[PDB]
């Protein structure tokens, strides 16, 4: 199985023990580590942060002791902006100069492939996305020589039915990508006005869910139906939670909320808590397991957090193994307890190790 794990460059600016640099990563934890995110500057792939180049190094020296470790560079992200990625993908010259810039850039910094993270193509960029995917794999193939391993090409895709319908030509795109990370998380957010688990395994109770689509099981089965080979699907499992501020004394699923949850001390993002932040939240909170969604949530005071834990993670890996998926994608290593000191016990990366272990268990 593939265990594909993202690392995010911005996880270095968190205070104290929240600071995560690629050298804090276990070389043998994942089969693939993807660095997020690179820029596209003057139609060339290029650095995003300032220390990317030195951090690129930190990541790829991990392969020295685990040569089988594969690393990819992810292009795009949220702050890139669909418009700019569109302008590049739609223009025939911009694509070529971009496509031609990628292989030398990846090789100089020791990456094994590119991971496309257009978040998210438009309805008007669906063909442009297909031609970009096709032409990228085309050049990766042409560029290969004896002694140059062909570069990998993957993509992070939305798990939302609506965007999948508008933006992706799954059947055609599947044939060119080496694997697809399906972002089967963030299904529920504060804009809905209710509590809801953001990464449920199944729809669960028919009344509770707002729509039939915002769950991992539907997303996986949908892409399979749209022509993604199971052997190329990598199922997203989050190591973070969506938090809400309760608007009443109710703490159940579907309870009214006043907005996102109070920001975490390390992530400093409203509505997001890293797993190591959740362990602190769990002190004096009551934990409830959503029976039909097979994932936990916790409440303490006016805070409600739906998150994944070691059991819900195993259930998800069980589901993907039974589905004969390619494996699991973890978002993200820096949101797991990479320190191993936050969540109790002695061990680092408790969630992603649970995935690795469930993937390895027969």
């Amino acid at each position, epitope marked *: 199985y593939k265990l594909v794990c993202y690392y995010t460059s911005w996880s270095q600016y968190r205070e104290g023990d929240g600071s995560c640099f690629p050298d804090a990563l276990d070389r043998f934890l994942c089969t693939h580590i993807i660095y997020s995110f690179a820029n596209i500057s003057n139609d060339h792939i290029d650095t995003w942060e300032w220390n990317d180049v030195t951090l690129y190094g930190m990541l790829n020296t991990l392969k020295n002791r685990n040569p089988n470790l594969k690393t990819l560079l992810s292009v795009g992200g949220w702050n890139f902006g669909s418009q700019r990625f569109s302008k590049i993908a739609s223009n025939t010259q911009s694509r070529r100069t971009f496509i031609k810039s990628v292989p030398p850039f990846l*090789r*100089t910094h*020791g990456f094994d492939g590119l991971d496309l993270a257009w978040l998210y193509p438009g309805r008007r960029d669906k063909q442009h996305f297909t031609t970009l995917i096709k032409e990228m794999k085309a050049e990766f193939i042409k560029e290969a020589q*004896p*002694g*140059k391993k062909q570069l990998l090409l993957s993509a992070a895709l939305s798990a939302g039915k609506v965007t999948i319908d508008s933006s992706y030509d799954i059947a055609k795109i599947s044939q060119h990508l080496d694997f697809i990370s399906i972002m089967t998380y963030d299904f529920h957010g504060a804009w809905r006005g209710t509590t809801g688990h953001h990464s449920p395994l199944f729809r669960g109770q028919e009344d509770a869910s707002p729509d039939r689509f915002s769950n991992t099981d539907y997303a996986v089965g949908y892409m399979l139906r749209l022509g993604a080979p199971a052997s190329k699907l990598v199922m997203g499992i989050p190591t973070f939670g969506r938090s809400f501020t309760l608007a009443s004394s109710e703490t159940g699923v579907g309870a009214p909320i006043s907005g996102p949850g109070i920001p975490g001390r390390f992530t400093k993002e409203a509505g997001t808590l890293a797993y190591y932040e959740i362990c602190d939240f769990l002190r004096g909170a009551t934990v409830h397991r959503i029976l039909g969604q097979q994932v936990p949530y916790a409440t303490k005071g006016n805070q409600w957090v739906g998150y994944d834990d070691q059991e819900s993670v195993k259930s998800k890996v069980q589901y993907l193994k039974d589905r004969q998926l390619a494996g699991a994608m973890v978002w993200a290593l820096d949101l797991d307890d990479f320190q191993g000191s936050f969540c109790g016990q002695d061990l680092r990366f408790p969630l992603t190790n649970a995935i690795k272990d469930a993937l390895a268990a027969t």
Partner: antibody
Amino acid sequence: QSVEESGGDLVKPGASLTLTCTASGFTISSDYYMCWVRQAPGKGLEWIGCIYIGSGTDTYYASWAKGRFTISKTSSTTVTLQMTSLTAADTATYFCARDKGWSNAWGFYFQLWGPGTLVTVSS
Amino acid sequence: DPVLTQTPASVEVPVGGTVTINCQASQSIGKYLNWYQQKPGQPPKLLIYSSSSLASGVSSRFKGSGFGTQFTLTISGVQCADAATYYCQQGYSYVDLENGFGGGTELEILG
């Protein structure tokens, strides 16, 4: 580590000629490329082609070579540049060079060069 | 096709001075640029492989720098025996190439 070219001669235009590059003490590694670079009198270096030694079946040629030039691995210690339909514009020194293989850190570079052999094309 | 143009065409430099040659590629070639020294009547000698690494037995007088499409060889403490033609070459691939080398730059050394 030695490379020496041979077979450079005077030839009539339209004729063809076969040059030979010979190796000496090559660290018994196959993963490398053997290439031919030509230099016309008083003009720059012009890459011709390469052959991958580990397979002896992968060949890469310059665009202008246009199939007149054929590189072949003939021994563990020899590769041959085979030139056809020669003209005055092919009058040049013909060098042989070698790679240390592909390296993500270092890349392709010609550390070994031969002294060259002269091909003079004249009636 | 990566196509390397080199400037200036020729340059005079006094003994013990410093020179800078410019080499630029029509496509990004990453860090894979090579520098060669060729004296009259001889094969080229590799000076710098990858953007800046020194070949065995080459002096630190030769410093390589640059990335992507523009590169630079800087010859320091210009020795009297440095008069030659200097070529740059892309070291990225052998596919769909016309010619990996540049036009070359000539050193005139002012003794």
